[PDB]
Design a protein around this ligand. Structure first.
Ligand code: GTS
Ligand code: GTS
Lengths: 216, 216
């Protein structure tokens, strides 16, 4: 049967994974927990056969997984996209980590009552983080070269998110601007982003001071 | 020449990596930044050839890496320890993530002025996190079975850290208590923990409210 991907009906930690699945054109069903289905999840949490019960989870005829990163890596690995040798795989793991520093950098302050104050500090450090990627993309179409890897969708998600926080944070980074457009230019992605499956909001959990709520 | 591992002279994000290197008996030199060498690092940060300048970093005749997780995975991968197939590698990635939830759970609140209040909330959720590992170890010597994998050293580091926070947090988890002793029973580990190379403190950056300072 078709693999089952479970998570809240938000972008959050699973969006990059959804994009990788669409890009690979893999078939899959989603168990989406609405903002008021917290209890629905609780009563099912310890009943899915998961060794480390959590959201997101990925269940398919061969495995039962939790931990967003093990999930996206599993999907990529099943398609030989993790790297052909130790060095390459490390490059790709390094790219994941660097993207997470930005994505997690947002979530870390998005649930605070003093978001604006934290935001200033954050938007103050973001430029140096972005420049590392800008330089990475100066002589590359995608993060790992001519071919797409899962970090590309992670970066895309992170850029999508920081753009909501500051629509001008990419003004000094033309390569990153083109990269985001380039990802949206991928047929499978453009199709998915225009379909009824696409969850455009919220970015974080509904209760978040930033990227939360039921509407943009 | 011998690989170079660089980081602050604290356990922090690199300790599990140091333990994996010792276990594998790999030769390596460390560029340790003292509490007052922040500037020493700044003036070298963008001069090491690192694509994503950060701490820790790992430089050896074949690669230049940053991102603690890409580093430990690289070392494990160079020894064929990441997993023999997609499923196994995902299991191992899942274990990393689950350990990080605990380790990062500590760092997230260790720099706050209200540590004690946050600590209560944290120590309230830790038991459910620990039990997942307790159950994982009920019919296994190590997290992935009979043989050691890098997540074992990550878990060890996390247990070492939560024990400083609460010396009794493992009282209901005998398998975890034995697991920690079992890791310390590994010849290379026992030797390293008794050598002059072992950095017992601090756990977090020196400025941390918890696990910080120059002395326990
Ligand atoms: N490290 C885990 C963290 C997962 C996590 O924090 N999940 C949250 C939701 S969200 O933060 O991703 O929105 C949750 O509610 N998990 C279910 C639970 O805690 O019962 C991962 O990456 O998968
Ligand atoms: N995701 C990175 C985070 C690294 C990080 O936050 N490094 C801190 C130090 S510590 O938090 O690990 O102690 C640092 O000072 N990096 C150097 C810098 O920011 O210039 C990783 O895992 O390697």
């Amino acid at each position: 049967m078709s693999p089952i991907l479970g998570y809240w009906k938000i972008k959050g930690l699973v969006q990059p994974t959804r994009l990788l699945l669409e890009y690979l054109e893999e078939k899959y069903e989603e168990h989406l927990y609405e903002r008021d289905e917290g209890d629905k999840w609780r009563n099912k949490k310890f009943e899915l056969g998961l060794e480390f019960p959590n959201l997101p989870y990925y269940i398919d005829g061969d495995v039962k997984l939790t931990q967003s990163m093990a999930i996206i890596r599993y999907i990529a690995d099943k398609h030989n996209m993790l790297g052909g040798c130790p060095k390459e795989r490390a490059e790709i793991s390094m790219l994941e980590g660097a993207v997470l520093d930005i994505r997690y950098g947002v979530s870390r302050i998005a649930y605070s009552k003093d978001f604006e104050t934290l935001k200033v500090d954050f938007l103050s450090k973001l430029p140096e983080m972005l420049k590392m990627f800008e330089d990475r993309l100066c002589h590359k179409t995608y993060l790992n070269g001519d071919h797409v890897t899962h970090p590309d969708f992670m970066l895309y998600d992170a850029l999508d998110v920081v753009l909501y926080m500051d629509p001008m944070c990419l003004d000094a980074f033309p390569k990153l601007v083109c990269f985001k457009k380039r990802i949206e230019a991928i047929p499978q992605i453009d199709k998915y982003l225009k379909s009824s499956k696409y969850i455009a909001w919220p970015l974080q959990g509904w209760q978040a001071t930033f990227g939360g709520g039921d509407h943009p």
